[PDB]
Amino acid sequence: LAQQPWVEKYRPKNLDEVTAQDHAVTVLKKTLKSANLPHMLFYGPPGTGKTSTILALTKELYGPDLMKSRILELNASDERGISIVREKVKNFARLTVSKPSKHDLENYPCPPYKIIILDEADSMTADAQSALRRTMETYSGVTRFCLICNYVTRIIDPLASRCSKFRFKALDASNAIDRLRFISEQENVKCDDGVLERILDISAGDLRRGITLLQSASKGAQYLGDGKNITSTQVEELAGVVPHDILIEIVEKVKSGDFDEIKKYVNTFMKSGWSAASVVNQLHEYYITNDNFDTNFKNQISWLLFTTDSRLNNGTNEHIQLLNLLVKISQL
Amino acid sequence: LPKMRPFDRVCLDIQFRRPDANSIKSRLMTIAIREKFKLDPNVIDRLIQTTRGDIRQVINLLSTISTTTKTINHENINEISKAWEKNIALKPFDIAHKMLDGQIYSDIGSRNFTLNDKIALYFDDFDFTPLMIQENYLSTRPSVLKPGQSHLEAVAEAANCISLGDIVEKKIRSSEQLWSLLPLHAVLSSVYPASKVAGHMAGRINFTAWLGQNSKSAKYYRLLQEIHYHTRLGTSTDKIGLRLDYLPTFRKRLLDPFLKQGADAISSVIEVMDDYYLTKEDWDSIMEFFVGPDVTTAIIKKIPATVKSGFTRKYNSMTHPVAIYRT
Amino acid sequence: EKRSKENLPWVEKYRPETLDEVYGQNEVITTVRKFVDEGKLPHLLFYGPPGTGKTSTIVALAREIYGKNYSNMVLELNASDDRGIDVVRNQIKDFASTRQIFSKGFKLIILDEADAMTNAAQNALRRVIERYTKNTRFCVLANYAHKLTPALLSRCTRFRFQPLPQEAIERRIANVLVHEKLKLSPNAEKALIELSNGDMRRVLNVLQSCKATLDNPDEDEISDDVIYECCGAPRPSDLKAVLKSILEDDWGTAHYTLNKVRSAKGLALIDLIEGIVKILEDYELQNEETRVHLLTKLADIEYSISKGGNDQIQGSAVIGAIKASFENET
Amino acid sequence: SMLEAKFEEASLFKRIIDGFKDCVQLVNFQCKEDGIIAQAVDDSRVLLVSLEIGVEAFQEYRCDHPVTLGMDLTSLSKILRCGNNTDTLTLIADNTPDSIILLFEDTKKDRIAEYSLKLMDIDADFLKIEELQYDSTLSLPSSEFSKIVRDLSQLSDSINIMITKETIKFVADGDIGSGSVIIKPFVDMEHPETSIKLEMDQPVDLTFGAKYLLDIIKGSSLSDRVGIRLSSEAPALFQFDLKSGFLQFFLAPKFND
Amino acid sequence: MLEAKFEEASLFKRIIDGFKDCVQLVNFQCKEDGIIAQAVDDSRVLLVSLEIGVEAFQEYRCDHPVTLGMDLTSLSKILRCGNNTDTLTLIADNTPDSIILLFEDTKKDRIAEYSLKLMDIDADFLKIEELQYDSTLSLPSSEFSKIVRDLSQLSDSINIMITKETIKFVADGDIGSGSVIIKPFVDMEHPETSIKLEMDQPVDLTFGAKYLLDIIKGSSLSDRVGIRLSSEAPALFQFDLKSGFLQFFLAPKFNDEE
Amino acid sequence: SLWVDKYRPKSLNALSHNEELTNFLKSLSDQPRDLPHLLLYGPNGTGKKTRCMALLESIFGPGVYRLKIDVRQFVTASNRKLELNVVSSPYHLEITPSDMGNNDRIVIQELLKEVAQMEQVDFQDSKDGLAHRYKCVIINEANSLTKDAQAALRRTMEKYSKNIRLIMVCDSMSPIIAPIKSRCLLIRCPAPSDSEISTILSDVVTNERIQLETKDILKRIAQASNGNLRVSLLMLESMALNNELALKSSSPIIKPDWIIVIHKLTRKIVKERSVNSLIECRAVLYDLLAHCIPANIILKELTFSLLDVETLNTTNKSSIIEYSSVFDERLSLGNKAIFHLEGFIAKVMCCL
DNA sequence: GGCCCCCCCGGC
Numbered sequence A: 001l002a003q004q005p006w007v008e009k010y011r012p013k014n015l016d017e018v019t020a021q022d023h024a025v026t027v028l029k030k031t032l033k034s035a036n037l038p039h040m041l042f043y044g045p046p047g048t049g050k051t052s053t054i055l056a057l058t059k060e061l062y063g064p065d066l067m068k069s070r071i072l073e074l075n076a077s078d079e080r081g082i083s084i085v086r087e088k089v090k091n092f093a094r095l096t097v098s099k100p101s102k103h104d105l106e107n108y109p110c111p112p113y114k115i116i117i118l119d120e121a122d123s124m125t126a127d128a129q130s131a132l133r134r135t136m137e138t139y140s141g142v143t144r145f146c147l148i149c150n151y152v153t154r155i156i157d158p159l160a161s162r163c164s165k166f167r168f169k170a171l172d173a174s175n176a177i178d179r180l181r182f183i184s185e186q187e188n189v190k191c192d193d194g195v196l197e198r199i200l201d202i203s204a205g206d207l208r209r210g211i212t213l214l215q216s217a218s219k220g221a222q223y224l225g226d227g228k229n230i231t232s233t234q235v236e237e238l239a240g241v242v243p244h245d246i247l248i249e250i251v252e253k254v255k256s257g258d259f260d261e262i263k264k265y266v267n268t269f270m271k272s273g274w275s276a277a278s279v280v281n282q283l284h285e286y287y288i289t290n291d292n293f294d295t296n297f298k299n300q301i302s303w304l305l306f307t308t309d310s311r312l313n314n315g316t317n318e319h320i321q322l323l324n325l326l327v328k329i330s331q332l
Numbered sequence B: 001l002p003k004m005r006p007f008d009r010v011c012l013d014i015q016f017r018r019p020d021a022n023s024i025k026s027r028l029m030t031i032a033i034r035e036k037f038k039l040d041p042n043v044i045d046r047l048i049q050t051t052r053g054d055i056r057q058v059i060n061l062l063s064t065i066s067t068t069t070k071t072i073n074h075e076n077i078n079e080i081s082k083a084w085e086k087n088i089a090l091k092p093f094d095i096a097h098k099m100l101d102g103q104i105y106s107d108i109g110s111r112n113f114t115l116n117d118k119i120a121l122y123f124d125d126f127d128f129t130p131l132m133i134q135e136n137y138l139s140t141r142p143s144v145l146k147p148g149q150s151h152l153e154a155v156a157e158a159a160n161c162i163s164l165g166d167i168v169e170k171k172i173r174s175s176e177q178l179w180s181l182l183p184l185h186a187v188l189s190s191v192y193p194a195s196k197v198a199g200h201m202a203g204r205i206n207f208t209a210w211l212g213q214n215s216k217s218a219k220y221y222r223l224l225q226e227i228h229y230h231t232r233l234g235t236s237t238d239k240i241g242l243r244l245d246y247l248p249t250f251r252k253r254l255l256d257p258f259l260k261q262g263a264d265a266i267s268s269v270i271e272v273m274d275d276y277y278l279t280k281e282d283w284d285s286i287m288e289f290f291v292g293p294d295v296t297t298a299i300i301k302k303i304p305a306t307v308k309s310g311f312t313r314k315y316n317s318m319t320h321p322v323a324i325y326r327t
Numbered sequence C: 001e002k003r004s005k006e007n008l009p010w011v012e013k014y015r016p017e018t019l020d021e022v023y024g025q026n027e028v029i030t031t032v033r034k035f036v037d038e039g040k041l042p043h044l045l046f047y048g049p050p051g052t053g054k055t056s057t058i059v060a061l062a063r064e065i066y067g068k069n070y071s072n073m074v075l076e077l078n079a080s081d082d083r084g085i086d087v088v089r090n091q092i093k094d095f096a097s098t099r100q101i102f103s104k105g106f107k108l109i110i111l112d113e114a115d116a117m118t119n120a121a122q123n124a125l126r127r128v129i130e131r132y133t134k135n136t137r138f139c140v141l142a143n144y145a146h147k148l149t150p151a152l153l154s155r156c157t158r159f160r161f162q163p164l165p166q167e168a169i170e171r172r173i174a175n176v177l178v179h180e181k182l183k184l185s186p187n188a189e190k191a192l193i194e195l196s197n198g199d200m201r202r203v204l205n206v207l208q209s210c211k212a213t214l215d216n217p218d219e220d221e222i223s224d225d226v227i228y229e230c231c232g233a234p235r236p237s238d239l240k241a242v243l244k245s246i247l248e249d250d251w252g253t254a255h256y257t258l259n260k261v262r263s264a265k266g267l268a269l270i271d272l273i274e275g276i277v278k279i280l281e282d283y284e285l286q287n288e289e290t291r292v293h294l295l296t297k298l299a300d301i302e303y304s305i306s307k308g309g310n311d312q313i314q315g316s317a318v319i320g321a322i323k324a325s326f327e328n329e330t
Numbered sequence D: 001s002m003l004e005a006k007f008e009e010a011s012l013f014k015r016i017i018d019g020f021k022d023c024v025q026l027v028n029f030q031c032k033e034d035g036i037i038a039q040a041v042d043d044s045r046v047l048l049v050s051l052e053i054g055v056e057a058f059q060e061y062r063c064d065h066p067v068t069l070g071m072d073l074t075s076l077s078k079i080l081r082c083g084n085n086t087d088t089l090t091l092i093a094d095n096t097p098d099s100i101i102l103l104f105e106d107t108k109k110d111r112i113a114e115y116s117l118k119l120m121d122i123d124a125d126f127l128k129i130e131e132l133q134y135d136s137t138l139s140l141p142s143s144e145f146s147k148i149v150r151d152l153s154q155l156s157d158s159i160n161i162m163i164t165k166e167t168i169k170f171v172a173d174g175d176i177g178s179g180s181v182i183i184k185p186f187v188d189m190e191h192p193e194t195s196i197k198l199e200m201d202q203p204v205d206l207t208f209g210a211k212y213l214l215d216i217i218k219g220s221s222l223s224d225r226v227g228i229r230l231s232s233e234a235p236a237l238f239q240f241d242l243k244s245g246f247l248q249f250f251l252a253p254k255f256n257d
Numbered sequence E: 001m002l003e004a005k006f007e008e009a010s011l012f013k014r015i016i017d018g019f020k021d022c023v024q025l026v027n028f029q030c031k032e033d034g035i036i037a038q039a040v041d042d043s044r045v046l047l048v049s050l051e052i053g054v055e056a057f058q059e060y061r062c063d064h065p066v067t068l069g070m071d072l073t074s075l076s077k078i079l080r081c082g083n084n085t086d087t088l089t090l091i092a093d094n095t096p097d098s099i100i101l102l103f104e105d106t107k108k109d110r111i112a113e114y115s116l117k118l119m120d121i122d123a124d125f126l127k128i129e130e131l132q133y134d135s136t137l138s139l140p141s142s143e144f145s146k147i148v149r150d151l152s153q154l155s156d157s158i159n160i161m162i163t164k165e166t167i168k169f170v171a172d173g174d175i176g177s178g179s180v181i182i183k184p185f186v187d188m189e190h191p192e193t194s195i196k197l198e199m200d201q202p203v204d205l206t207f208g209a210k211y212l213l214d215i216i217k218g219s220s221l222s223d224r225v226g227i228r229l230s231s232e233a234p235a236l237f238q239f240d241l242k243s244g245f246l247q248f249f250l251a252p253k254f255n256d257e258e
Numbered sequence F: 001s002l003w004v005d006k007y008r009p010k011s012l013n014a015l016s017h018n019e020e021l022t023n024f025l026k027s028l029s030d031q032p033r034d035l036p037h038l039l040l041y042g043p044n045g046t047g048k049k050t051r052c053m054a055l056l057e058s059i060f061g062p063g064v065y066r067l068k069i070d071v072r073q074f075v076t077a078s079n080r081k082l083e084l085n086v087v088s089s090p091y092h093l094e095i096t097p098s099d100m101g102n103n104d105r106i107v108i109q110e111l112l113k114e115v116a117q118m119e120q121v122d123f124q125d126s127k128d129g130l131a132h133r134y135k136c137v138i139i140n141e142a143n144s145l146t147k148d149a150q151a152a153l154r155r156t157m158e159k160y161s162k163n164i165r166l167i168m169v170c171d172s173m174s175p176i177i178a179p180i181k182s183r184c185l186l187i188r189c190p191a192p193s194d195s196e197i198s199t200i201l202s203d204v205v206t207n208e209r210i211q212l213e214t215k216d217i218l219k220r221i222a223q224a225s226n227g228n229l230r231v232s233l234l235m236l237e238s239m240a241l242n243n244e245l246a247l248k249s250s251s252p253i254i255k256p257d258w259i260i261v262i263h264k265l266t267r268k269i270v271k272e273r274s275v276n277s278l279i280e281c282r283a284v285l286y287d288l289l290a291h292c293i294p295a296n297i298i299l300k301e302l303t304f305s306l307l308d309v310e311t312l313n314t315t316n317k318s319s320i321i322e323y324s325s326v327f328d329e330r331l332s333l334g335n336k337a338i339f340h341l342e343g344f345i346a347k348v349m350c351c352l
Numbered sequence G: 001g002g003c004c005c006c007c008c009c010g011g012c
């Protein structure tokens, strides 16, 4: 509706709206007529369409009437301790399947099992996870398990072995452009050539972020009230991308090599609010793609950037990390 | 033990020491004569050294050994002493003293007190040993310094290892409850840092002061939270911002004018309190936060008692608004 | 179950029912058969990695010993159930100290996944095991031996379940193909074994996914391309090309090749790193520090990837680490 | 509806449900034309409870096809407690039911309560475990058995029952002491309910746990007499006869060593 | 200046006990007409309205309307120590920082008068303008207890449906589902167990276990309840007083599927 | 009331800096029905909270500024009763779960879901009495939340999208997890320029009747604030109060006590490098930490004061910054702040 | 007899 965000408004409803996950969507569709759906483990980067995919599968399998009575969904917002897993999940799995109505049996396949969707399974403790090993196996004939996670390493080996793994690929401009273009036409958003491709490139495998950026750009254009097409500079500004001029000044200061000047420039730069991750990514792109540096310089800078990114991913101060990275690069 | 605290000053305290080897020699010789087994006097002391002041334990030892061995001489004293050695967990001070000794970390000492022995010593009290090590590793004269290494470098290495052990401890007590890492925490927190500064203590061993500091910081944070939520309706900031930026400016209005206008600044202070929903207890808490050269204890004490009495009377003689109801 | 067994997943549909359907554990199977054929059945400790068939083996042994009505004559406790000190004290002791109900026989207790049990329960079970040994026997299934107390280990005869050999997996695959009327190319079989890592559950899951992927299973043969598409794993040719470009080509073209290979089929960086590690493990290096640097840097990169982060930076780091490590060869 | 069973009084079903709720957790009911049967096995796999209720215990009973219903006894007891002790209880089930409907209807008013309990998938058989010719059988008032069990369970957790020539002996050996109770069969023609009967083929000596006997004697409120049947190499049978059905407890004797 | 001599102090005790859990800080406006109060729940989801008319009090008089934000927990603390049959009065003064509760009695010995502190609670110009509510009825409270306590053990929803000649309580959950239907039933010998119901359009609204359980805890105040349900307005549960009543506007739960 | 609080703008049209951000906020508030979840990030003391309040006032009526404070009770797994101070408005809600430490997740799993799972009573500006809009919840200092709370929020912000909207303000996005960033609309708030700060200070001075001979006075305050506006206003107020409401060209810049303590520590470490010096630094660190001074701020200020020493060389500064970078991560992954601060100080003293 | 609540280890 008009009172919902575009990310939720254009959420897939069926399995035919999934764009770049055909390798698993085809298997899921075949399971509709095969009726032998196994335990599933959906893993991949954020914003790839895993929860949407499982919701669409459950809808197409059961119907809006049987969805409530055949699906049990537990996520990180509910207590999922060992006791909860041993009591509630066990009781639901061991229960008999709800009796479908003639309407549902006529218009839906109505598979003879229920589904438990453990979203954000990577947040569950190992002890709690170990309690499901026999639960899934014993009641496989009446219940099926769907574990959705972002880090596959957080799932214990027995559960990964029991579940069938499904990897969701990143959504880039080469496979997710069609959906973004369709959304743009539906919303009557006018954009210049390459704007959607730039949005998808900035998103880096996150269609939700791209949709949010498109919505923000459309809102800005509507508020402007000029009718001009959306450009790429405005999109970059809305995405927090550092201007190329600032990057040029940064690399020139690094090439200068003076510690005091670099420190002063970093102090001035950090007052603008630019995210450290974006700066590091832009610096990595510029330095790696440049042909004016030798093999050793790139060899060292790659490791330096990797270390800086790893340290930043732990939630540290951006100023200190950025200053250290720039100082190290200047001494390469 | 803390459970004995209530008995601090309500009973006559009578302390019994471990009997000396000469106060029980006659009794033990009499027992040996009565039981018809030879007991060489020259080896008697070691028995107490084996039993460590326990007359009951040494009597039981004699009773057991005399069952089949009728002679107790220097030929078999070593075997019985080794077999009947009593193991008692050391106290945190004793643990710190022993772990910070350079003898055990030498080539010859290591063969007697092994790494497993040090880990067991740590495990005797795993809730206090890391704190004692972190507290008492800066007051030693190391004797195991590497050729060319200085005391400061060893101290820095020990501090880095202590930080790593702190990270390990934080991971141990997380939601995963990874207690299997406790042995690792033994090395990263106590054994390794002590192995770099092992030697002779430069002074008395001091109990860890981190607990009192933590309690004081918790109390200070509670008072800061109370003040922040009392002034939330007026300020646009968090408790951290309130402490770092707002408190000096507030002092400029709630303490400074008492030192210049005397008792004539009561009305302005009360007006500020009403504007920011502050109370006298909040005033005391705020004036107690400052550190460095801006301490307010001496300044507050030097304030004339008449001014403080008048301020209290004025505060208690009028109604004040309340920000939070039923706190 | 519901309806028929055809609706069950292949992992559960093909669960062995008898002991002769367990493959890759000939020694253990023969030993247990001999034990149950002449009455000398001791306490068992089946230690092994996931997907070896320990639970299936013990279930088949119980069925052979007791028969069809084996569920009512054995006490099966697993991690899904509450197994505390009180449970061991009361329920297990009563089961071990009481006669059978339906028919004459000895009492069997199967503590599956006992590695998730508390130390107090394990300590309590010692005297229960050693007191009712005449009429009761204990079987414990484990994946990690460090979670079991030494006292419990001392009272059980240890049997280790090795990873499934190649021939056993081929035989099971042939049986599954016969049952499902499916055809598999030899290269597809080799790829399946390579990616299987000795787990039969992975074999069954990947085979089911491949069957679902086929346009028409009646007259379509699964090839290596189908397996790679279903699992999304990189092809060996792509790994070889990426390694060649990294080793000999310069920075720009190596980066371009890696990006193109990854974007062609949406490959993941961790699988590429794993394949490169497998390929380089067979390289006859002339120096040791080169291998040390390779292993350390690749382990660091894998650990960083496990927690997420920027993928492009991680790939550049992989390339730089490989180049720097191979620079030491001279 | 397909299966519709009407009870004369909800208390009639409630008392039988309460008679064995404290010893088993999961129950399976098979409803047919002859009546309703059920067997439950406790977690320790030591005690088996077998209940049968005939059509004569129901006002109106209709069952076209056999129905298998898996339930949790705790949930069923809770729902029965939710119902009153003066309303009419109706068991309602449909083909391949996913739930069982308990209908409480009050004749005085127009209040109808319809509770639904989700059924449970418990795939198991009955095996009709019953020894053709037990070594010995006996029958005696339930109150006396309950008193003896409660008295002898206060001394020890194990009770030994010996059947020999014209005598039944219950022995408990504990820490504080020991106790023995001996009863000889006799027939009274003026209070037949208090008579004790015994028919033996071979002497018997079997040991049982005190907790299981304590839980078994809890069904003394459903009958005035209890029949105990003992047989070597066979579970001991404790039968309480109902108005038109019966309740049975099969208890495995402890291993002798 | 103001007095509210009660016919029975237990009446006021039950009045306060009826909404102590829902709200704790409520403004009481004491006009010559009577006592009026309306407090918004701290979550801005439940409005506790209340009014006691002049008729209920044995002797009520006031010279100038005054609003008192006096607490409720302290009210219970004061009233719990009192006897059963008394004539509580609420005397105050021109500038009251406290209100003197005169616990008068017919006898001159059983007197337990106390003093209750007053506290400044802000009040807003809230409005309860009437709307064309589809259904409204009244029925005893014992049935409410027997139904709510029964359905709470099976689910967290006490969904209420009001159809012609039918009143349905529905509660579904993990264990199962439970539905109880009550219908117009009048007893000539016992008129108290009767339902007075009038509906215009069908209504169905899902309500919560905790809210209704708390409400029925305080249902000892009035032996009869009042249901009012609409289609777009917050349905309200009322407890009739001697001359006024105690209303509870509770917002219905959001429906995601519809 | 303090000048920093008395002159706070209460509308989007009253903002005096970052006009582009004001235009973006106006565009967002033009059609607030489809407003996505918002995440504001930028330097501290720039006006992120003020801009959020202005946006809320643009969306709802002026009544968003009538705030109240209530107390909420929570129970943990150990039956521990915890109190949370909740700041609420008739149109919006504000919460700071970090005040409950590792228990912040409970607030996500108990409070927010209570508000988002069902409707509200709106007897004002309505005909039926029920709200016909969404509620805006402001989670202050989202970077301080634990990972579990964010994971719980992941589905909460999605399955109640059109009933509740979240506006999260933070000074850094590094602690924020990727899923939360993906589910939020990023808004960058740059710090005001020196000229804008000087203009605001001049407006305050001219509206407060403060004598000022030269405007350059205010300029210095800006160079002493490093982009912070709250610090600038507080420093101006303190200077005015310390100089009899008359700023002079010779008036010094008033620094807070903790900054002076950190400077003392820095110039003691530089001058003296010994174990006894490290013990004295331990005492100083205990004193600093016991009085509600965050460890991260202490480390940052100590590092940036060490780097400002005119006697140290490039190698020493590089070693100091490397050690600071390592020990910042150590602090982020540790509990005892001093355990890492002492290590950093020891490493710095060794490298000098 | 059953909840409900509080204190205390947790590696080999």
Ligand SMILES: Nc1ncnc2c1ncn2[C@@H]1O[C@H](COP(=O)(O)OP(=O)(O)OP(O)(O)=S)[C@@H](O)[C@H]1O
Pocket (backbone or CB within 6 Å): A006, A007, A008, A010, A011, A012, A017, A018, A019, A020, A021, A044, A045, A046, A047, A048, A049, A050, A051, A052, A053, A149, A150, A179, A207, A208, A211, F179, F182
């Ligand atoms: N394959 C997709 N096809 C179409 N839209 C998608 C797809 N994936 C994501 N989106 C869009 O982005 C929005 C969010 O997708 P999500 O289902 O939340 O991704 P996700 O994989 O669940 O993210 P995580 O791992 O739980 S943080 C959807 O409502 C869609 O509008």
Ligand SMILES: Nc1ncnc2c1ncn2[C@@H]1O[C@H](COP(=O)(O)OP(=O)(O)OP(O)(O)=S)[C@@H](O)[C@H]1O
Pocket (backbone or CB within 6 Å): A158, C010, C011, C012, C014, C015, C016, C021, C022, C023, C024, C025, C048, C049, C050, C051, C052, C053, C054, C055, C056, C057, C142, C143, C172, C200, C201
């Ligand atoms: N030796 C085997 N022969 C045939 N199939 C096997 C074999 N081992 C495992 N499988 C297959 O994989 C499925 C699971 O085997 P499991 O018995 O569950 O392995 P497991 O060792 O018990 O796993 P863990 O150690 O409890 S995680 C079986 O149903 C079989 O279909």
Ligand SMILES: Nc1nc2c(ncn2[C@@H]2O[C@H](COP(=O)(O)OP(=O)(O)O)[C@@H](O)[C@H]2O)c(=O)[nH]1
Pocket (backbone or CB within 6 Å): B236, B237, F004, F005, F007, F008, F009, F014, F015, F016, F017, F043, F044, F045, F046, F047, F048, F049, F050, F051, F169, F200, F229, F230, F233
């Ligand atoms: N005149 C003016 N003052 C502002 C503006 N924005 C912020 N301020 C002032 O700066 C003070 C601090 O801003 P604050 O909201 O706390 O920033 P935050 O803590 O980073 O979110 C505020 O109390 C205001 O007085 C603005 O746009 N115009």
Ligand SMILES: [Mg+2]
Pocket (backbone or CB within 6 Å): A050, A051, A052
């Ligand atoms: Mg999702």
Ligand SMILES: [Mg+2]
Pocket (backbone or CB within 6 Å): C054, C055, C056
């Ligand atoms: Mg298994």
